[PDB]
Design an enzyme around this catalytic site. Structure first.
Site, PDB file in Angstrom:
ATOM      1  N   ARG A  93      17.463  -3.380 -14.058  1.00 55.51           N
ATOM      2  CA  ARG A  93      17.892  -4.476 -13.192  1.00 55.51           C
ATOM      3  C   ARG A  93      18.473  -5.622 -14.025  1.00 55.51           C
ATOM      4  O   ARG A  93      19.472  -6.235 -13.644  1.00 55.51           O
ATOM      5  CB  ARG A  93      16.746  -4.950 -12.288  1.00 55.51           C
ATOM      6  CG  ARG A  93      16.407  -3.959 -11.148  1.00 55.51           C
ATOM      7  CD  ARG A  93      15.423  -4.530 -10.119  1.00 55.51           C
ATOM      8  NE  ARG A  93      14.080  -4.678 -10.668  1.00 55.51           N
ATOM      9  CZ  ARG A  93      13.043  -3.890 -10.394  1.00 55.51           C
ATOM     10  NH1 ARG A  93      13.156  -2.877  -9.543  1.00 55.51           N
ATOM     11  NH2 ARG A  93      11.875  -4.128 -10.976  1.00 55.51           N
ATOM     12  N   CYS A 112      13.323   9.946 -11.308  1.00 55.45           N
ATOM     13  CA  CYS A 112      11.949   9.585 -11.658  1.00 55.45           C
ATOM     14  C   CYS A 112      11.016  10.797 -11.720  1.00 55.45           C
ATOM     15  O   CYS A 112       9.797  10.667 -11.587  1.00 55.45           O
ATOM     16  CB  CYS A 112      11.406   8.512 -10.708  1.00 55.45           C
ATOM     17  SG  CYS A 112      11.525   8.920  -8.940  1.00 55.45           S
ATOM     18  N   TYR A 155      19.170   3.515  -1.955  1.00 56.30           N
ATOM     19  CA  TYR A 155      17.714   3.599  -2.144  1.00 56.30           C
ATOM     20  C   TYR A 155      17.245   2.262  -2.695  1.00 56.30           C
ATOM     21  O   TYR A 155      16.581   2.197  -3.724  1.00 56.30           O
ATOM     22  CB  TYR A 155      17.314   4.740  -3.087  1.00 56.30           C
ATOM     23  CG  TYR A 155      17.876   6.106  -2.728  1.00 56.30           C
ATOM     24  CD1 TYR A 155      17.167   6.989  -1.921  1.00 56.30           C
ATOM     25  CD2 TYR A 155      19.103   6.521  -3.234  1.00 56.30           C
ATOM     26  CE1 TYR A 155      17.680   8.245  -1.607  1.00 56.30           C
ATOM     27  CE2 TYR A 155      19.618   7.769  -2.932  1.00 56.30           C
ATOM     28  CZ  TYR A 155      18.905   8.625  -2.127  1.00 56.30           C
ATOM     29  OH  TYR A 155      19.433   9.863  -1.834  1.00 56.30           O
ATOM     30  N   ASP A 163      19.104   5.519  -6.744  1.00 57.21           N
ATOM     31  CA  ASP A 163      17.750   5.648  -7.266  1.00 57.21           C
ATOM     32  C   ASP A 163      16.917   6.527  -6.335  1.00 57.21           C
ATOM     33  O   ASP A 163      15.979   6.043  -5.702  1.00 57.21           O
ATOM     34  CB  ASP A 163      17.125   4.260  -7.410  1.00 57.21           C
ATOM     35  CG  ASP A 163      15.832   4.276  -8.206  1.00 57.21           C
ATOM     36  OD1 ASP A 163      15.505   5.320  -8.815  1.00 57.21           O
ATOM     37  OD2 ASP A 163      15.151   3.232  -8.226  1.00 57.21           O
ATOM     38  N   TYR A 171       8.534  -1.402  -7.739  1.00 58.93           N
ATOM     39  CA  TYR A 171       9.003  -0.600  -8.860  1.00 58.93           C
ATOM     40  C   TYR A 171       9.290  -1.424 -10.109  1.00 58.93           C
ATOM     41  O   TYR A 171      10.443  -1.762 -10.401  1.00 58.93           O
ATOM     42  CB  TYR A 171      10.228   0.211  -8.434  1.00 58.93           C
ATOM     43  CG  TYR A 171       9.892   1.184  -7.329  1.00 58.93           C
ATOM     44  CD1 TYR A 171       9.392   2.446  -7.621  1.00 58.93           C
ATOM     45  CD2 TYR A 171      10.043   0.830  -5.996  1.00 58.93           C
ATOM     46  CE1 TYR A 171       9.064   3.335  -6.618  1.00 58.93           C
ATOM     47  CE2 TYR A 171       9.721   1.715  -4.986  1.00 58.93           C
ATOM     48  CZ  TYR A 171       9.233   2.967  -5.304  1.00 58.93           C
ATOM     49  OH  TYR A 171       8.907   3.862  -4.307  1.00 58.93           O
ATOM     50  N   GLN A 187       0.827  -1.201   0.000  1.00 63.77           N
ATOM     51  CA  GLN A 187       0.000   0.000   0.000  1.00 63.77           C
ATOM     52  C   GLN A 187       0.861   1.251   0.000  1.00 63.77           C
ATOM     53  O   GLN A 187       0.710   2.108  -0.868  1.00 63.77           O
ATOM     54  CB  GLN A 187      -0.948   0.027   1.203  1.00 63.77           C
ATOM     55  CG  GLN A 187      -1.396   1.435   1.623  1.00 63.77           C
ATOM     56  CD  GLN A 187      -2.016   2.235   0.483  1.00 63.77           C
ATOM     57  OE1 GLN A 187      -2.733   1.689  -0.351  1.00 63.77           O
ATOM     58  NE2 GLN A 187      -1.722   3.532   0.435  1.00 63.77           N
TER      59      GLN A 187
HETATM   60  C1  LIG Z   1      12.254   4.667  -6.203  1.00 68.40           C
HETATM   61  S1  LIG Z   1      12.515   3.607  -4.756  1.00 68.40           S
HETATM   62  C2  LIG Z   1      13.995   2.702  -5.283  1.00 68.40           C
HETATM   63  C3  LIG Z   1      13.623   1.393  -5.972  1.00 68.40           C
HETATM   64  C4  LIG Z   1      14.746   0.363  -6.080  1.00 68.40           C
HETATM   65  N1  LIG Z   1      15.960   0.926  -6.671  1.00 68.40           N
HETATM   66  C5  LIG Z   1      14.254  -0.860  -6.843  1.00 68.40           C
HETATM   67  O1  LIG Z   1      14.885  -1.310  -7.802  1.00 68.40           O
HETATM   68  O2  LIG Z   1      13.210  -1.423  -6.511  1.00 68.40           O
HETATM   69  C6  LIG Z   1      13.198   4.825  -3.598  1.00 68.40           C
HETATM   70  C7  LIG Z   1      13.566   4.235  -2.238  1.00 68.40           C
HETATM   71  O3  LIG Z   1      14.264   5.212  -1.508  1.00 68.40           O
HETATM   72  C8  LIG Z   1      13.959   5.117  -0.130  1.00 68.40           C
HETATM   73  N2  LIG Z   1      14.344   6.437   0.379  1.00 68.40           N
HETATM   74  C9  LIG Z   1      13.750   7.664   0.251  1.00 68.40           C
HETATM   75  N3  LIG Z   1      14.549   8.590   0.833  1.00 68.40           N
HETATM   76  C10 LIG Z   1      15.653   7.967   1.317  1.00 68.40           C
HETATM   77  C11 LIG Z   1      16.783   8.409   1.994  1.00 68.40           C
HETATM   78  N4  LIG Z   1      16.944   9.692   2.304  1.00 68.40           N
HETATM   79  N5  LIG Z   1      17.744   7.492   2.340  1.00 68.40           N
HETATM   80  C12 LIG Z   1      17.605   6.156   2.040  1.00 68.40           C
HETATM   81  N6  LIG Z   1      16.475   5.721   1.375  1.00 68.40           N
HETATM   82  C13 LIG Z   1      15.536   6.620   1.022  1.00 68.40           C
HETATM   83  C14 LIG Z   1      12.505   4.690  -0.098  1.00 68.40           C
HETATM   84  O4  LIG Z   1      12.290   3.883   1.029  1.00 68.40           O
HETATM   85  C15 LIG Z   1      12.387   3.852  -1.362  1.00 68.40           C
HETATM   86  O5  LIG Z   1      12.535   2.496  -1.026  1.00 68.40           O
END
Ligand SMILES: C[S@@+](CC[C@H](N)C(=O)[O-])C[C@H]1O[C@@H](n2cnc3c(N)ncnc32)[C@H](O)[C@@H]1O
Ligand SMILES: C[S@@+](CC[C@H](N)C(=O)[O-])C[C@H]1O[C@@H](n2cnc3c(N)ncnc32)[C@H](O)[C@@H]1O
Lengths: 385, 385
Positions: A205, A327, A222, A287, A198, A193
């Site tokens: 990947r 993104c 990330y 990311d 992604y 939810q």
């Molecule tokens: C767009 S997703 C990345 C997807 C991942 N690369 C994948 O292949 O599935 C962004 C991620 O960044 C994390 N995030 C957001 N701000 C962050 C921060 N300041 N430090 C570490 N993680 C962060 C979120 O929890 C989220 O999981």
């Protein structure tokens, strides 16, 4: 028998966008609004047909075109839209996006497919109002075992819609088993939810896994549930995954356990974590969410990205690869290039542009909807002379 | 004893470019030129080292940096540069670009490899002056059976250099047998274009072939020797190759005959030919020549491309693919998108951006040298709702 047809008249000279398949009309482009809210026909200044769509001043976009040819927004119409969507995703495996909103001629609807389970999001007033019509059509065409609804709370709120989460049809497991290229991620619905999964990074990947050599060190920043890191591990590399979401790291932990793979995990924020690492790593992946609301916010965002990339490059081994994704539609490839050039200059590093990639086919980039493109990735290799 | 180190001084504040691996320094950026022409060391306003390169006021670029660390431009230096270049192309097959100028730390030199034969061109005074030094190094590292030199006649003249065309080492056959993925093109070197063959399109040709189904019709415009067309034929499609160079089409005919494949050929110019075709075709490929040689020419060439793309789109079957490449630095992706949007609007067609690609790894895109990237391709699919 019925009320008079709802008809919108477009300002002279502003009808070209609709004729060219851009679905959104804003307030200032409407010469004469319909005599109510609901399914409406848009015509030009001379009364010629342009589109059928949904008119609602409470929506962020007052008129969203659903179709560019005459006809109703009935069950059969939606059946045809979902049939088209399904056909477009043939051969894209089992885990993919099935419906990507306006690019698929379905404004405000996102549908993701995970095996026999659909997860959807309703983002606009028109699609919400037509739910009773399109949902049976979706179920008929796809015939899923279950359908779950998640909500983009802010998107709903901006549309004046309530949040809506839960099973909408059939059976959906408490733990969604997301499968991608032999990898299984056990994602609890609560996490599904909040975030989701992604699918848009799937091709990145795949490219990444083919590049990893056994024994290499990988830093996956990330990481979310660790799609990149887990692939690195499967290839025999040492991976360190970094994310602030402990729930997501929990999934990666379980996913790695299932396969007898070892993945190092750091629960923490990206920049502070990277500042505390020595390195080097043969691959560094970034990311970040790059939320840009207004264009004037861009220079500040790019300065933050420079801080991140400077650490990432510092941590990058000789001839290593750095992956930088954005993104946001507002953050262009050119902006990523500028960020990379600034970080490289700070460290005196020489880099090659190894690949530039864009979102995959199941997240269609329409030529006619400039903001359809949101995800792009710059892959750099350290390139000393 | 030797003369003093030839020493160039860069204007205060203009040295950042060199420090960040951009090799070109212009007249307006030089505070104090060296004593004479030849190998020179560039230093900043404070006398700190920047680069070693070649200074010659007769060159388009008065100073081109060859290396960004101290040392001579001797045999061993060039040996190291060619060794690096060779290593970068491991696993890139037997045919590929070996040296892509400044991006490979070798300003003004291009070297293409076709099996045991190299074809090179020398594009600036520095490389020309040092050929007695670098050619033996190239031969030592690569050990080819033969080396042929072609001239970009125009570029040579800009550098105040004569035409040079012919064998500069060993044995080069009259007809260069260029091999690519089981295709063999017998290209007479004398009447050949550039280095003989467009290696930069290799990855696009691979991507294209994977999309062709038997019975489909393919229109390959600006075909040259028919790399795209021939791949279409081998996959069981009908291909029509269009080019205004009759010699190139002759090569295509021979290549097809060898393989027992049928390819239709039109000797003619692209826009006139497309204007006289009815279609439709399932794939239409447009690979024009540079077109835009100076930025001032961009608007006129975009008008021409709109005309071309309008015809190509008219000729495109439902759900067909249209490939549009630009090989000019001055003609960007955004320009291609603009051209496509205009053409699609003229015809009332709805298109999806299927892929954007850039030149392959053997034609390196340096982050620090924008003009190292010249080729990019927009692939569109017809996307009706
Ligand atoms: C767009 S997703 C990345 C997807 C991942 N690369 C994948 O292949 O599935 C962004 C991620 O960044 C994390 N995030 C957001 N701000 C962050 C921060 N300041 N430090 C570490 N993680 C962060 C979120 O929890 C989220 O999981
Ligand atoms: C970049 S090359 C195309 C290479 C080819 N697509 C391949 O894969 O090898 C450009 C080609 O355009 C041809 N050409 C230049 N102007 C043309 C025109 N007006 N009409 C048709 N062909 C043209 C040249 O002969 C040359 O073969």
């Amino acid at each position: 028998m019925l009320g008079p047809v709802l008809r919108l008249v477009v300002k002279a000279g502003k009808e070209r966008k609709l004729r060219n398949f851009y679905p959104n009309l804003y307030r200032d482009e409407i010469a004469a609004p319909p005599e109510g809210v609901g399914v409406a026909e848009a015509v030009d200044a001379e009364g010629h047909f342009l589109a059928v769509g949904y008119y609602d001043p409470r929506s962020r976009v007052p008129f969203r075109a659903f179709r560019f040819d005459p006809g109703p927004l009935n069950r059969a119409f939606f059946q045809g839209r979902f049939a088209r969507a399904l056909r477009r995703r043939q051969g894209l495996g089992e885990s993919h996006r099935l419906v990507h909103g306006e690019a698929d001629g379905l404004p405000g609807l996102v549908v993701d497919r995970f095996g026999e389970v659909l997860v959807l999001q309703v983002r606009s007033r028109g699609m919400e109002a037509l739910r009773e019509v399109w949902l049976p059509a979706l179920l008929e065409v796809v015939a899923p075992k279950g359908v779950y609804e998640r909500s983009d709370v802010e998107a709903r709120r901006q549309e004046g819609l309530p949040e809506r989460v839960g099973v909408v049809y059939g059976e959906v497991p408490e733990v969604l088993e997301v499968e991608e290229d032999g990898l299984r991620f056990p994602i609890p619905l609560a996490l599904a939810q909040k975030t989701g999964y992604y699918l848009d990074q799937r091709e990145n990947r795949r490219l990444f896994e083919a590049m990893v050599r056994p024994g290499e060190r990988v830093l996956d920043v990330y990481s979310y549930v660790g799609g990149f890191a887990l692939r690195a591990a499967r290839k025999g590399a040492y991976a360190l995954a970094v994310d602030k979401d402990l729930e997501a790291l929990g999934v990666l932990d379980q996913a790695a356990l299932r396969l007898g793979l070892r993945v190092d995990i750091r629960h923490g924020e990206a920049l502070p974590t990277l500042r505390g690492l020595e390195g080097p790593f043969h691959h560094v992946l970034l990311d970040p969410p790059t939320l840009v609301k207004r264009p004037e916010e861009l220079p500040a965002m790019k300065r933050h990205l420079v801080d991140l990339v400077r650490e990432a490059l510092r941590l990058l081994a000789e001839e290593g690869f750095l992956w930088l994704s954005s993104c946001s539609y507002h953050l262009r490839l050119e902006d990523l290039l500028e960020v990379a050039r600034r970080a490289a200059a700070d460290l005196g590093r020489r880099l090659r542009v190894h690949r530039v990639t864009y979102q995959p086919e199941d997240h269609p980039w329409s030529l006619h909807i400039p903001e359809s493109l949101y995800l792009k990735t710059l892959v750099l290799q350290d390139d000393p002379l």
